[PDB]
Design a protein around this ligand. Structure first.
Ligand SMILES: NC(=O)c1ccc[n+]([C@@H]2O[C@H](COP(=O)([O-])OP(=O)(O)OC[C@H]3O[C@@H](n4cnc5c(N)ncnc54)[C@H](O)[C@@H]3O)[C@@H](O)[C@H]2O)c1
Ligand SMILES: NC(=O)c1ccc[n+]([C@@H]2O[C@H](COP(=O)([O-])OP(=O)(O)OC[C@H]3O[C@@H](n4cnc5c(N)ncnc54)[C@H](O)[C@@H]3O)[C@@H](O)[C@H]2O)c1
Ligand SMILES: NC(=O)c1ccc[n+]([C@@H]2O[C@H](COP(=O)([O-])OP(=O)(O)OC[C@H]3O[C@@H](n4cnc5c(N)ncnc54)[C@H](O)[C@@H]3O)[C@@H](O)[C@H]2O)c1
Ligand SMILES: NC(=O)c1ccc[n+]([C@@H]2O[C@H](COP(=O)([O-])OP(=O)(O)OC[C@H]3O[C@@H](n4cnc5c(N)ncnc54)[C@H](O)[C@@H]3O)[C@@H](O)[C@H]2O)c1
Lengths: 302, 301, 300, 302
């Protein structure tokens, strides 16, 4: 198994580090800037030795070293104009070198960039995905667990839609070790105002990390990606929210959007859960924005 | 941190093995049969070396080697003969390691956790039995199989005895936060299929026995270890375990399988709002545990 | 997609399954001849997996045809004469069902039984091995680390070849510092080291005499680490039963020796021995050769 | 109740936190002088924790008094003149707030900065150390394993001396699964010229990473620190090369320098192995430089 990291910045490097700790595969660290992937590859090699990992690591500036890659993680970029061009190029490269790879897009804007990759990849839509939902879900589930003074380990939630202010958090589909969130407002352990406070924090978390750390989150995104890698390689069928190809699900077809999905051997597959009309309405507006910003994107690339 | 296994049979040995794999603490393997814990201790030590674990392991037949234990895992036994064994372990824990968190495993479980309380005189929050997590594990695994998904995020509350008056709450079953109800709506699983799964979960212990000619060992050990983990690392994880109810679910002054958080200071019950058919099934379960527990204490004299 | 087939679902095979699940090595096929035993243990491992968050497929079966295209084979099936018959049958089954699997034999007597597997499997010799040396090495390295009041983690040793072990003090080191340096500084004695050697020689029997059962956890861990090295193309250096082909003056026999395991199987390594280092080993290699031909004769 | 206090929340300190979370070593305090950085990184590690099922508490602070009663201290604070300023202040703070912590200094120049910390903390000398040898050892053993086409897992080596240009790698104390390196030169599987090449690479590895990645190694240093943390907390007695207080060992007195040591409950304890005269010579001269640059250091700080 060869895991190709297209982009060897902060997120790509920590994905490699975590793919080594768990023995997921050999690493290809690719970047456009000479020297950066070679230096980080050497560091990961010594890290590997210290911790008893024997996987192969190669830092390269030559994209043809992506050949027969089973996994692809795209963080290449720095936005809609400059990253879309980069994403188109990587897309073409993935077609002629590693057409049978499972592809996890990360570059922002996410839901826009996953569609750009699809249009120019000619890859199957089930073999393509973006990571967003798991990061929003984790922040929401952590904030709920803190207030309920419980471990986050068994706090579960569905959050539909794009990675931004077009989130759709489903309180209906939130549970604490199988006990719905409702049961906790019932027992006056949490209030609806507190839950809506938590939702806006979840919506603003990306910007809050940036304002404090003067840099976008890296560790949590890397962990989300690694778990999507894991799900695919080990045919796990785990249920995530991800950018995924809808095909009639939630009244939408022919667009990658943040949705519920299974990841396994054959890729990322949407799941349709029964929504209210206010749940499906908010989501359709969310899906509409992604549709308009994606076609503006395709045109700006001209 | 010293983790004391009172009973070095099939389950106790795998608890040690798993607490070594995760570096939970030093092990004291105690048993009544001479030589058995010493032999198994040596094996776990070579196992430890092979995989790079440095925790100390001591196999002994001397119960006084239980002193200052932080964790206690009781598998000692084979209602009459195990309850009198459990009384002895209880007394031993009283004078040697009174401030230990205690995880009872010996069967019948909810009966034996009460036996331990009566004779240990330990605080009620420092005592527990493992049952619910093992039943929950079989139920959620069977649900995940039918729904063609990973079990990893299938969660469920199961109240009551570790037996054939289990109370599985379909209301409190969810798949990555989505209630099971949503899956019967979309016809991905049926109510009869779910009642299949319930009778299977109730009969799994006997089916393992009837197939393997031995009671389950790995899954129980894993359930115990996760309760050990929750306590040592102050995790506040939400399990179903045997726990001291005191008004919760209309029951007071009895250990029974219930919802609880485990942390630093022990095992703490949580009362969720049940229907009356949910609370009725549970109260009858709680009634049997109360009747068999007083039956139990009687045969021990 | 990686399939790990356990031929034998007793104490060792069950713990090998458990450990390959904990480490996500692959899907499991638990095979046994006794009806119900692998099905029961498979169910237990499934619930164990759920508790610990492992998603691998688990199949308990009594039909050997379910071992098809297995990448890994772990043979614990048995109970001298009668285990060889069992091993011959397992060998034939592996050629018809899973001919390109890497094969780790465990059933005793070990060096005799892996040779039995070779004669009847028609498998390549590099794809076959038995687990022994790692268990003797670990016990020796554990006892040394205890005496030196050090972690075992970086105590390494070569032991070639039961009563016919070859512990090489010259090839013993503590994080790269030879054992030599520790007797120099009066931290351990030559008599202490020879006591430790005999404890290592007698460890199997005393575990039996104390626990009234042969070791299971440590053997399972040794096997899992050979499984690991093969699947992840690790090239780790073990002592195991391995096919010698001129190495150490011996050819055409599986014997306990130094080997690297990788993608391509188990491959002997020849280190430079003195002459009674090689002399003692040649007697050991002679013992395995006579009892192996004794074995093949008793099997008819 | 184990508290791991990271004094410095840059690249190395952040990955130390991440790795002590993956292994459940303790709760984290991320301290830094720059407002917002530790708070932001703490949030990221918290969400990282949720995704991977870790429940240990993490707090990012700009208030140094928040390291109180810490069991572990990892000092990466800095950027000889100005970092000695920082290390003296950190030293004083550790004295009055967490005097019984085991202290792992990382800021460089390492062997110089560990002595600075000792002078102004007055902590017990067995409770103070710097991480260097394990990073040099890993690079050397990695390069040896590559040549010999073997797993690095059982390549072991002693490297004495400063973390710089006068390292002292002991081929005598190099072994492959217990077999000395010499046995491989006999078998013509490696040459001494190749081994001296490997030594020059090991000596220059830090600068080579810098020139390629335009940033110092982070992953491997963090892993070295974490395993030193591990050895201490779990009373492991593992044998490392670290900066440690020698007092008569190797003809050296009253100075922290890279040497062989056991780490356990009670701290870091030197071990003296029998060296030849060429081995002890090369070591005394490195030890001489560390002494001269440490005396330069103490003078520059006033
Ligand atoms: N979807 C999420 O939830 C999540 C969360 C936070 C950030 N983001 C986004 O993920 C992306 C990655 O973040 P990061 O920390 O890794 O950024 P980074 O700067 O640290 O790394 C990006 C790398 O891509 C490289 N690059 C640029 N052009 C390239 C090309 N044409 N081919 C190959 N490589 C190329 C850059 O040299 C750089 O090394 C960012 O756009 C960020 O905004 C995603
Ligand atoms: N709580 C649950 O959900 C659940 C599930 C499975 C098993 N069980 C029960 O857990 C118990 C242990 O299972 P096991 O496989 O490990 O049994 P085991 O026979 O293999 O080990 C029990 C050990 O306790 C020893 N022992 C006997 N008397 C003793 C005494 N007076 N003091 C100390 N030790 C003593 C025995 O010699 C034996 O070594 C069984 O009763 C089993 O039915 C409970
Ligand atoms: N190489 C070593 O260092 C070492 C160390 C310890 C044990 N051993 C040996 O490993 C072997 C297994 O040990 P164990 O405790 O796990 O044995 P076990 O009895 O507990 O399990 C062996 C299984 O093989 C099964 N079996 C029997 N006949 C079979 C057949 N014809 N086909 C398939 N399966 C069949 C048995 O039913 C049994 O379930 C023993 O021979 C033991 O002596 C080797
Ligand atoms: N010991 C070794 O073997 C080895 C190897 C590599 C790196 N280093 C050194 O380890 C140290 C850390 O490396 P890094 O990548 O993490 O550096 P970094 O710049 O990325 O992070 C250091 C942090 O210390 C902070 N800081 C600055 N001044 C401070 C003060 N007065 N008090 C508290 N904090 C303060 C900075 O804001 C910065 O965030 C560096 O000196 C590095 O050069 C040592």
């Amino acid at each position: 198994t060869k895991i190709a990291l297209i982009g060897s910045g902060q997120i790509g490097a920590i994905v490699g580090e975590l793919c080594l700790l768990e023995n997921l595969g050999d690493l290809i660290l690719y970047d456009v800037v000479p020297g950066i992937p070679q230096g980080k590859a050497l560091d990961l090699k010594h890290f590997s030795t210290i911790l008893g990992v024997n996987r192969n690591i190669l830092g390269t500036n030559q994209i043809e070293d992506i050949k027969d890659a089973d996994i692809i993680v795209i963080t290449a970029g720095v936005l809609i104009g400059v990253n879309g061009k980069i994403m188109k190029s990587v897309a073409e490269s993935v077609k002629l070198h590693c057409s049978k790879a499972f592809v996890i897009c990360v570059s922002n804007p996410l839901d826009i960039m996953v569609n750009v990759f699809h249009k120019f990849s000619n890859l199957p839509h089930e073999k393509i995905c973006g990571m967003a939902g798991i990061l929003d879900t984790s922040r929401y589930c952590s904030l709920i667990a803190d207030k309920l003074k419980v471990s986050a380990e068994d706090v579960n939630a569905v959050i539909l839609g794009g990675h931004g202010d077009l989130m759709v958090p489903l309180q209906r589909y939130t549970s604490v070790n199988g006990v719905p969130l409702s049961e906790f407002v019932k027992k006056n352990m949490i209030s609806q105002n507190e839950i809506q406070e938590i939702i806006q924090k979840t919506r603003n978390m990306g910007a809050e990390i940036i304002k404090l750390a003067k840099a976008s989150a890296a560790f949590a995104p890397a962990a989300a990606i690694t778990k999507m890698i894991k799900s695919y390689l080990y045919n796990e069928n785990n249920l995530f929210t991800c950018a995924v190809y809808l095909n009639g699900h939630y009244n939408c077809s022919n667009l990658f959007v943040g949705s519920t999905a299974k990841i396994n051997n054959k890729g990322a597959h949407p799941v349709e859960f029964p929504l209210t009309k206010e749940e499906q309405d908010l989501y359709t507006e969310s899906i509409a924005s992604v549709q308009s910003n994606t076609q503006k994107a395709f045109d700006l690339i001209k």
